[PDB]
Amino acid sequence: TDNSTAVQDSNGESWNTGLSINKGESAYINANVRYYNTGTAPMYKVTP
C-alpha cells in the first residue's frame, strides 16, 4: 500500500508579435503636385 502527495508550482511568460495586411488595399499614396500656367489668361478655380 502506497500513499503519495505532489505539489507542482508553474510560472510562465509569452511574447507574441504579428502583422497583417489587406492585399486589395495594401497602401495609400499621396502625390505632391504643383500647377503651372504658361498661357495668356489667368484661370480661376483651377480643377485639374
Partner 1 sequence: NTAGDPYTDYQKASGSIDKAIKLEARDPLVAAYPVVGVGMENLIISTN
How many of the chain's residues bind partner 1 (CB under 8 A)? 4
* Nearest residue to 48 via CA among 26, 23, 31, 25: 31
Binding mask 9-48 for partner 1 (x = CB under 8 A): -------------xxxx-----------------------
- Is 5 a residue that touches partner 1 (CB under 8 A)? no
Give the Cα separation of 17 and 20 in Å (integer): 11
- Is 3 a residue that touches partner 1 (CB under 8 A)? no
Interface with partner 1 (CB under 8 A):
22-25
